[PDB]
Each structure stands twice: as C-alpha cells, then as structure tokens.
Design a protein around this ligand. Structure first.
Ligand SMILES: CC(=O)CSc1ccc([C@@H](O)c2ccc3c(c2)[B@-]2(CC3)O[C@@H]3[C@@H](O2)[C@H](n2cnc4c(N)ncnc42)O[C@H]3CO[P+](O)(O)O)cc1
Length: 183
C-alpha cells in the first residue's frame, strides 16, 4: 500500500501526481523527478533548458529499464527549468528529469526524499541538491537513512512513528484534495 500525492507546477495551471510508499516523508521532499518520457515534460520545460532536456530524453531512450534502475550506475539528469509546490508548506521543489525514474511504473513521477531513499540520495549528491532529515536514526548527509524512526522537521508529524505519520499525512492530503492512499 502507498499513496498518490499531487503537486502544482509553479507559475502554470499544470499539476502532476507521484506514487510514494512513504507519504510521511513529504516534508523531506527537496525536489521532484519525472521520467524523461513523462507526458508533462515538454509543456513545463523552460526555453533555457529545452535543448538539454531534448538531449537527455534522447540519451534515456537508448537505455533499458534494467540499466536505468541499476544502483551501481552513475545518476544522470537535467533540470526542466520548472518548480513544483509542496502541498504541506507551499515550498518550491525543482522539477528534474532523470532516467532512474521509469515511465511505466506508478505515475512515472516521484517526490525525491534524498535523506531516506538510496537512489534519491545518490542523485542529490551528484547534483548538489539539498538533503533534509525527517526520520531520525542516521546522519543523512553521509548516508541515506532507509529505516524507521521518529519524525523530525515534519510539523504536525513530529514524534510519530511510520504507521501514525502515514495515517495523519494521508488524512491531511485527502482533506486538501491533493492526496489519497493507493494500492
Ligand atoms: C512499504 C514500506 O513502507 C517499507 S519501509 C521503506 C523504507 C524506505 C523507503 C525508501 O526507499 C523511500 C523513501 C521515501 C520515498 C520513497 C521511497 B518514494 C518517494 C518517497 O517511495 C518510492 C517511490 O519514492 C519510488 N518510485 C515510485 N515510482 C517510481 C518510478 N516510476 N520510477 C522509479 N522509482 C519510483 O519507489 C516507490 C516505492 O517503490 P516500490 O513500489 O518498489 O516499494 C521505502 C520504504
């Protein structure tokens, strides 16, 4: 079981939805990543980034799913030039494309939580993106912390465990109309 979370694209009437197994880490989402093949990419890419996005989409189409999701391969990607809006606090999150996100799985878009997801962490370290701890237990600048722990830096989720935080965040999202549990 997981959840869908919907993000508005800043400065537009566009939105996209991600699939996440950990809606409770929403306050640690410091960027979002679309599959290079995602349907929204071309419409939100800025003119300055357009050529780099086109070049990267071509590169990504020449790699299989297995090579793209391989943990040992160097992370690659490019900024679209656009920002998503985090629904819980209104903060802007840069929208990247990266081939470790697969078009066919879930929605083809993720919220990136580099502190607590190994692939997001590798991407953030490769591209100097912020890393924000929301589950205590590790030292997230040195190593992704991929285990359970009490929530921090998470407003009304602070002090809760995974099961409680997930229930609370999903309730908040369903109530704003920008999230729901998904299986
Ligand atoms: C079921 C549980 O609670 C088990 S405790 C657990 C502990 C750590 C992690 C960790 O890693 C993690 C941390 C945070 C986030 C996650 C993960 B996220 C986004 C937020 O949840 C990911 C989601 O990003 C990513 N993802 C979705 N769509 C695609 C796609 N199209 N391409 C490539 N990646 C994609 O992967 C799904 C689930 O993956 P599953 O369905 O294989 O389980 C997790 C659990």
């Amino acid at each position: 079981t997981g959840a869908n979370v919907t993000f508005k694209v800043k400065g537009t009437d566009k939105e996209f939805t991600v699939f996440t197994t950990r809606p409770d880490t929403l306050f640690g989402a410091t960027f979002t990543v679309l599959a290079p093949e995602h349907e929204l990419v071309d419409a939100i890419t800025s003119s300055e980034q357009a050529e780099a996005v086109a070049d990267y989409k071509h590169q990504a189409s020449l790699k299989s799913d297995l090579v793209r999701t391989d943990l040992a391969k160097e992370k690659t990607g490019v900024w679209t030039g656009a920002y998503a809006i985090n629904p819980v606090n209104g903060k802007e999150m840069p929208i990247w494309i990266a081939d470790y996100v697969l078009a066919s799985y879930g929605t083809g878009a993720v919220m990136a939580v580099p502190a607590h997801d190994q692939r997001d962490w590798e991407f953030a370290k490769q591209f100097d993106l912020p890393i924000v701890e929301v589950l205590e237990g590790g030292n997230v600048e040195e190593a992704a912390y991929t285990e359970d722990g009490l929530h921090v830096n998470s407003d009304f989720l602070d002090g809760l465990n995974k099961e409680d935080a997930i229930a609370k965040i999903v309730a908040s999202l369903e109530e704003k109309g920008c999230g729901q549990e998904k299986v």
